[model samples]
Target: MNANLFARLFDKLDDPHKLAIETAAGDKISYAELVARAGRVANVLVARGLQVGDRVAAQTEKSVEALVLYLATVRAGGVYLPLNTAYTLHELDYFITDAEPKIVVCDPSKRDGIAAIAAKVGATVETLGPDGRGSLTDAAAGASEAFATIDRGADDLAAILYTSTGRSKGAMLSHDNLASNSLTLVDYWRFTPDDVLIHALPIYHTHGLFVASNVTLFARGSMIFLPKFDPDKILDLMARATVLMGVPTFYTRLLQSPRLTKETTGHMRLFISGSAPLLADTHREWSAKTGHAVLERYGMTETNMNTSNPYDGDRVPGAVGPALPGVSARVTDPETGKELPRGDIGMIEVKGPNVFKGYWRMPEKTKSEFRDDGFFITGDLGKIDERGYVHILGRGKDLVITGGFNVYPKEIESEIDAMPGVVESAVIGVPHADFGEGVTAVVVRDKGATIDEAQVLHGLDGQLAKFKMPKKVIFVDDLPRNTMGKVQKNVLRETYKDIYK
Candidate 1:
């Protein structure tokens, strides 16, 4: 476990002035500027009486300044916890209290709210202005220009990413864990210096930081950041980028952009999709429009990325490709923990360098998350095809058990998505008097298209099992999704708990 791999990039380079970050506001920050500025930030932190291994939480959006703060915390040997900017005051308060960060960095508009919360926790709050500059700049201006990198063990806590567990749960990631995962992904994905990544995803998530940006930085490639997602703007930026990674919703939004022609994406060498299931239609439509199928990958907050579709092979549609070079995955019976044969759906477990050490401060919960054999028991359920491709069914928590039979909503949702007018769908279990839980399908139809509940039921008649089909269907304008475009099934479940029986 090498904890210094990230900072080592700066130490090894001759001229740190090479372009490091290009923001949406037309700001270009060279690596030299980044290193120097981060050193100043480190000085400021030390001057504030912060000790090594202390936690510093940042709640700013994607920007060149945000990137600097990330490196500064790591350079100072403190744990960096990046909170999702979309988190409300209450949500932000929860993490502030739990992590007990020595300092909190946030935007000016959020200063009062975060200050109030920090006061409650007896921590300091620093605000970054609308231009994305942090409050430490004044203190950092005249600080010593030279400081040695902190001596940290590989397993020392580097970053703490707060994941939503229906509610919120802390997923503490070690420096070694993220460093190893980034290096593995770089090799597995064949990232090189020539690669220019179009970073349109939010940076708070593992997909953006550990998966895309960190790997690109380690490979010495350039990253073009987008403050917020806009399909047309993304297409415009794709002209200079060789690789593009996004979620399924991004692809859908790109398809909606009239300017997205084959020529617009002609320069892209690889297009990757994850964070949510890629509908078969979205996959086919992307290929039809861009001359390449979306390379779907599998990952979670706990494990950065275990498997990825190959960069130079037949990327099987509807599958998440194979395990990476140093990763191993197996499907096992949920109750027995016995290995399941190929094509049999079961709980998916992974053993790899990318897996996190355990949940932060939750020893009891962490003990239950791993198997006796050392594999991290991913909450996901999936099956391996004969060709070794992994097809994820859904999360174990998302599985709907109706009439004593297991029903994965992804299967039903995929079927409905393949239908003519369905745009997106979610399935949840509602309480029933006779059956323990009844399955219900909720959907948002495509614009200018009309789909009736009868039509949805008819569409699923042949594709889904009798027990798996939804007994009732609800139509909505939109489904509730998180910042990463993942549907919040817990919210749906809570809202519709009494809709059945």
Candidate 2:
């Protein structure tokens, strides 16, 4: 009767001798050890006064310890709020101020910076180093390894993922939302305990944290726990791993290496791509080289996995297969809120247990995001083809996804406008070969003031995250605008679309 996600995931870990994670250095962690580790960490959270439904914010680097923190948070009946490691202190301040986590876990190097932020919110700060040695681990060492898992309801909030759609908005996902989505994916993707996953993606994002790790844990599969995506290291690990979940950039980078061939990846069972649109060319090229069709899935921060290319059926080139089991998706006219006919690109609306109920502390915004009928408006421009495959054309909002990370144009634009000698700025996503979409900024300066691209980038050195920073900054006279005085980002996209080509 335990509805907690950790309880369900732990059920699959009954076998003590079974492997859970194989670290980068080839250290194998058994399922029993993982469970005991999670128990100890959960005890630390409770001892630190983490109450039911309290947020445990973590901005630590990728490690086995970081992964245990997530499980421990759920085990303690706390909501996990994972922030990107690349996020700047300014960005961290905003998230801490909003979530008001009971405890903030950060990288050991960042404790000095994050402690100041956590202190403002009266939250305790703990550090977890990449080598798994820090204040957090120090505390866990003294904690008991037999703490009982706290009770949580299916409808209880499990996590709050902040989106980059304009100002950051935290999407509140329930326990059932994550459990359902992961379970559905485990069946759809044919995951088994024998399958080994190459987890090279960062654990902070949904693609890695929720979809990849949750599916693997639910199915009791082992992971080759890598810190980050490295083409050479990934190719080397492919010989032992059966699956790889990555972004478009990972495929493109892997394709560049001569080491990627049918012989090298002959034992691989699946290579799934998501977080950003996978190019048809890359898909075809990957299949030709490795003799395995890369399965592309569609999802966002609001909804985990809406659609995915089938595991046993025809893996379409450009389309993410169809709406997942128990999930409903439809293309709706952006203006009328009416469902569009198949084959017509429009705003994609979805409704299911996987869809988050609302945004944290933003009821009015949440109310506007969902329809009267309960479908959550996704703001993504996509269409369902005759075969039921979903083709994502672009985003309706000014959100730019670069290298699997969502970047809000408004955030970059605001940073640019505050720069000295700047008049106004417009940020847009331009076509890119590696990143899928490159963050580009078009700026206008004062009449006599002179500012170059380097100067503009210099001004934003420490103010913004590395991912949100512009790949290209172009000096311009003025930005094109509509009758309502809104800058025409669509026009900006068209003008510089070929710059990256």
Candidate 3:
């Protein structure tokens, strides 16, 4: 009944010599070796002053060692904080100051900069490289690999994942939150020890670390752990992998290759997409080529996997499907705070064990996010359909109000993306003279495909309402995206702020 998430996952390692992880280079680590390595790393963490509730912040490259550090942090009763490797020194300083971690782990190349930042917070610094050679590994080599798993309560903090939308705030996930969510996902996804996952996502994010890695660990499955997403590498490994968890971009990139066919993925069992909205075109095209409909799921850093396309039922292209077994989801009017009927777009709110405890050390901010009744306002605009499937329109902040009418950008973008010669599109509300905001579309076109602004507007002439149509369309090489592949609407808004001025 121990509440430690790692302990729960550790219990599944019944076969010591069973394969746990296979590196991109074909290097393998067994379950027994993984646990032993994690134990040694845990010993190092304890020796560096990590306590029951202390934070162990890591900003390192994706490696088996980095993953082990996460496990070690949990086993040592420390809150694991994984920072994006792309964060600048200025950004690292802010996180280091706010988290006040007991120890800081970083890539050896950034040791001096990170050490200086950690010094300001009085945090001990350790180095770990992508190749698994660094000060931390050097120390762990001599450390004992028999450290006892620390006993923690269900509500104790296990990890702190910081959101990147704006000013980042750490979302504190408790032991129970991770344990319950992983358990639900493992069952819902039908994972087993026989399944081999192709893990090509960065370990810093929730999709890769918690959803992908934890599910595989809890189900006692193996993972072909790649440092980053490589389309060629993934396709080559698909024959050996049964499951692949990735974002929408991964699928889009794979579709560009001629080798992406039903025969190439013949042995593959599942292709799951999340972290960003999957385009319906990409979904249909992938299904046509591979004969497997990609299962799209919905989740955020605060809450892990919430809803997913069913394993046996219809995997709708645009809908994220119904809520998980223990989770509750509802759509409410943003201004009125009243629950809306099915098929009405509004604010999304979710409540369940998977929801995080709160933002780290921001009690008031956390209180404001949750309602009086306990549902966490997701700040996302979505609704449930008659079929019980959830349709995520977009973020609440991204909702465009032009001429006193609320416009969901996802709807407009969907139309533009489906147009001929159009690869993808992002709709945003920019400054306007008459209307409060002008509906604008920034589009990316396919190579050698000539589609002008007039052509795009003409295509949507009858398909959409007059007010819903984009006032202006701008061609772009590509849409700005965050590390997780979500379009940076804020960036687009800022760039074209004066387009209609």
Candidate 4:
């Protein structure tokens, strides 16, 4: 019900010395050590004058210490704002200025950068290394094993996660909102203490923090942290893990690795793919290689996990499956603002506990993002089948209006991916004096193969409407993707903006 519920997980177990986390550095943290260490960090935060409702910013790589700091912040009743370690100084400054944390924690190497921002915001800086580590360890050793607990309500803000909108804006996620969503996943996905999760995703993202990390913490499960992702290493670790969740790109890279074998993932009980569309080819290739279809789920920064394919039932490819229990999803017209009937592609809107409170401090943006009826406008286009399965089309902003007809790139990309000799493709609309916007296809061909424009046009003739087919095709070596393996469409739109002008 609240972040404190995780502390109770240690209470039910007889042995607090059991393994709580195993780091890639070969360090194992016992539950007792984890609790005690977090307590030490909490004491330090209190000494530094951080109070409940204050924000503490952490920008560090994945480590046992990082995890302890996160728990400590929440234990001290402060909101934890984790910044991506990969973020540049400018990006870090923006979040620091926006959230205005009471203190900034950074790796020793990055302390100067964090300090510069802290000075700008009039916040203190703390470095985590031998000194910080010894201080925390000594504090935990000298202090009583038990300490008075602080009162933290379920509605209190736990953390504020800043995520990009493929634009200049970012979304802030609160504790109560994310915790509610996480519990929903634990019940629906059947996550339990017996599950050993292979965590290869970046901890800065919601997928790693909320879905993998927090869910495991809530279930009192064990997690193996791979600080960085390597396909072969992931497959090797999968042999010891019961559940592995990653983005579609992770699967694609895994399939590309020649070392992959059915035995590589023999011990895994479940495999989940998200953060982008799981291409049917990627699905079939994985099943062919591993003998199991990766369960695909639907989610975003605003909502952690809204829909998932049944864990015990038919797992369909190319579909994100049904909405999670307690979540309502529907498609609505973009222009008329009317809810669309089944099988009609339109904007996908959802209403659920998982939906965020709103974009942090941006009231107008928040108001415009949701419908008057309380459904969060996903900015994505999708349709529900008669059976209630949701098929996601691309983003509403990415729709290509060509010759008075609208074309969703995901549809065209799926069709192109189905064709032989094509590895992947990205479709974009370019400016045209005549048609207003011309559809352009940027493709990556398989090795030893070349695709002709005429051949591609001919291939689409029977499958697509005349106007829906791309007017031009440009072959590219690769597409730009973010850390989560999601295509940076904003970058694509900008890079090719002058192409057809």
Candidate 5:
């Protein structure tokens, strides 16, 4: 990981002067100008004494300038760490200490608190709000706007993303990890300069940052950049945009609107969904209503985009299609670690250049995750159909993905069990109408204690992010368990699968 990611994304781009991003604020930035903005941003970091392999942690609101800073970090040979904007001061503390970034950038409103934390860690702080006003831009104003791109190998680290629990693990990704996936998607999805993507997902996640942004750049296309997802705005922009990449919520919300008709989206060339499972019903309704199937794919923080529904073949509803070109996916027994035949449910393992290098600082943990062979265990239980499509069943760790964010049960349950009335708890994901899956918890009260659902929910206010909070909680005498005393989350999930409906 010697070819730099920025050079691939910005160099030799077609229609270099064409508008790269058109924001709701009417700010239109061209491709060549965006590259120059990244250069100036790179120069700012160089002036601050940050060099190759240094980390720049960003937790600011989404804007065109935020994207510029990410590109600049890579162009200057530094690692970019994007944090969730919803993170509290408590959550940010661990990340700042662990990464020990050279520069910490946040929103203007959060500048003071973040500055204090950065000071303790011996890192400098800068501000860049949603409106794009802050000390970061103030410094870039005086810097030269032509920093040269650093030469990097395919294995050089480019970014670090976290998979959260009460504890978090930083997954290290390299130049090839990002570039190979972008190139594969561009060819797989049939992108062109004429394509215009309706970009709405948050930049903090891999789907928005690595998949959507890089694929658009690799194809030399423009984007209708919205601050966030809005049902009405998406329909209005579809007539002008040729493609849409979003989570399942975007489709469900759009389905509720009468404006989402065949005529409204007739001009669109493709509609893709991922980051969470798309409901089988949503897929059929979307195609029946709009006359086109919604293509769904599967990937996670460790691997960027491993599989996608074919652009030219059958777009299955519950299946995530097959592995992308240049990637190998196989199913193996979770215990025996032997390859399973097609149609046998087992652990999904993948091996490809697109796979991440390893965890940021956990060598033993990384070693345990891979087999004697080169294939990296994905932790997801699934099977490949006779047609070679991958169908994800469940995670071995009881992982919950609500609204496109991973929420492990142990992380949330640990806090819930600490409350006065709890004896034990089991958290699971149930079918959700809008969220795709709602995080639900089942708790057992102490022998002589009394606790309500709201009481348990109130205790987790600052302990977890919003998406990880349980949408519903049920009190039971005891959690369903086997003779081995292992909590049966599968049974809990099945019993309350329709709590949201």
Candidate 6:
């Protein structure tokens, strides 16, 4: 019954001093240093009265220390809740209230502002900085570096990853959900101790922490872990790194770089992109330049990862390849929930150990999202090819996935409609060269009201995250509506389809 997620990560390692991570700051963290620091942090959290299954929310900038904090939380049998650093105080409050974490680790700068908010939720606030100057480390400095790992099983909850569709909901991932996927990915991608990943994605997201980081750890490999995406930096490290997992934006930017020749990436074994659609032309574009294809994969916050382009076969461009080994995927009728035949476009449903247990504290909501069978409705629209590859068409829900981040129009529209001068608003996704789809808003101002695009967007600074802010706001006389009075969102989408082009 002992299947601690942390143990699964490090148990395969033979050399404790092997270089496990190299931070952007040029600091190298060895496997020995990682486990020792994790032990210390685990002691600190345990001493602070954190019990098993308690939530430990973190919002620190990406650092080796921050990553270790997550590992330590797992070792201590606490639930790791990672919040985006870009989350505003308002959004932070919502997550804090929802998760009800026992301890909230955030940037030192934001701690004072959120003191009352954290206290109200019965959470003690600690600080962790990118430069290693936070109180959390100070507390861990004197803690013991040797302790027994907590007894945990595969079904025990490991992390609560919050994802937004129309609203934010925390997906409870079990140790089995994480361990099974990592084991599968390590074998499928052919990872080994010889590999070194160039990790540029933020640790808060599933693409980075769970998929990339856990895969590397289980493979007993290393990483060139950058704090954020820098094309030049990534290009320079490609020579030394063996693998890179990133978003489509990473490739687009790399394609613009002149140094992205076959020589610079001559040693790189793999390059994978996800979190958003990779334009099929990008597949041909990259292959033309580097003589190598960028393998693309598909996943979500609900499921750690579900499908990927074959590592052996040609990595399909628009298609996300077959269902991952050990995972079952099928396209089903969106209305009837019956599995469809090949080549039929419908909703994507998956059943596997990789699928999350359910939404945290929302049993009925969780039950409604699943079927009588184990397959969970992914809410994403796609179809299986005759060869068993899954081609994602678009979203069944009114979700605008901009630059890999999911933004719901309902949330944005709700805020816009509340503005005094606004009659109503319709938010739609338009084709964007950069962000797969840009969040574009079409608004109707009240008669004689002087509200303009600038005025409407100006009021949203503190209310919404920067990513959720509309790229362009257009004023209109009225939004198109059906005879039954439903907003014709499809018309709005077609109208601004070329707004970016």
Candidate with best TM-score:
3
Per-residue lDDT of 377 in model 5:
95
Using lDDT as the yardstick, the better of models 2 and 3 is 3
lDDT of 5 by residue, 1-501 (tens): 248999988878657889899987878999998988888899998888678999999998888889889999999999999999999987899899888899899988888888778887788888898987798899888878888899999999999999873369889999999999999999999999999999998999999988999999899998888889999888989889999999888898999998888999899999999977665556767887898878888899899988999998786534689999999999999999999999666889999989999988888989999998889999888778788998786675676788887666655665676676576778899899888889998988767777788988888887667888998889999888888657898899889977888
TM value for model 6? 0.80
Clashing pairs in 6: none
Model 6 weakest 10-residue run by lDDT: 276-285
**lDDT of each residue in 26-69, candidate 4, tens digit only:** 67887788887777778777777788888888877776777777
TM-score, candidate 5, is 0.80
| Model 4 CA deviation exceeding 4 Å by range | 1-17, 129-145, 165-170, 313-317, 415-501
Query: Can you give the TM-score per candidate against the true fold?
Result: 0.82, 0.79, 0.85, 0.82, 0.80, 0.80
lDDT for 359 (candidate 6): 94
- Could you give the C-alpha RMSD of every candidate to the true structure, in order shown? 5.1, 12.6, 4.5, 4.7, 12.3, 12.6
**Cα displacement (Å) at residue 104, model 6:** 0.6
Which 10 residues in a row give candidate 1 its minimum summed lDDT? 1-10
Give lDDT: candidate 3, residue 489.
87
Q: Sum up the clashes in candidate 2.
A: 0
lDDT of 6 by residue, 241-348 (tens): 899898888998999999998898898999899977665556656877887777877799988889888887675434788989989999999899998998676789
Question: Which lDDT tens digits does candidate 2 get at residues 1-501?
Answer: 788998888864457679999988899998899989999999999999899989999998899999999999999999999999889998899999999999999888888888788999989999998887899999999999997888888899889999872789999998999999999999999999889999998988899899989999888889989998889999898888899999888998999999999999998999998876554556667878998888888899899999989898786544688999999999998889999888666788999999997999999999999999999998777778788888775664667899998775655665677566776788889989999899898988777877889998888888767887888899898889999656898999999989988
Mind giving the per-residue lDDT tens digits that candidate 1 earns over 1-501? Answer: 235544655767755677777878877877777778788888887777668888888888777667777888888888889988888988888899888889888887888777788887667777665467657665677787576778777778788887775556778788777878888878877887778888887778898877877888877787888777777788888888888888888899899877877899988888888887787768767877888777888999988888888888786644788888788999999889999998678989998777788877788888998999889998888888788888788766677888898878876776787777777789888788877889988898877777799988988887656888898899889999999667898899888888873
Task: Please give the CA lDDT of all the candidate structures.
Answer: 0.80, 0.87, 0.89, 0.77, 0.87, 0.86
Worst 10 residues of 5 by lDDT: 406-415
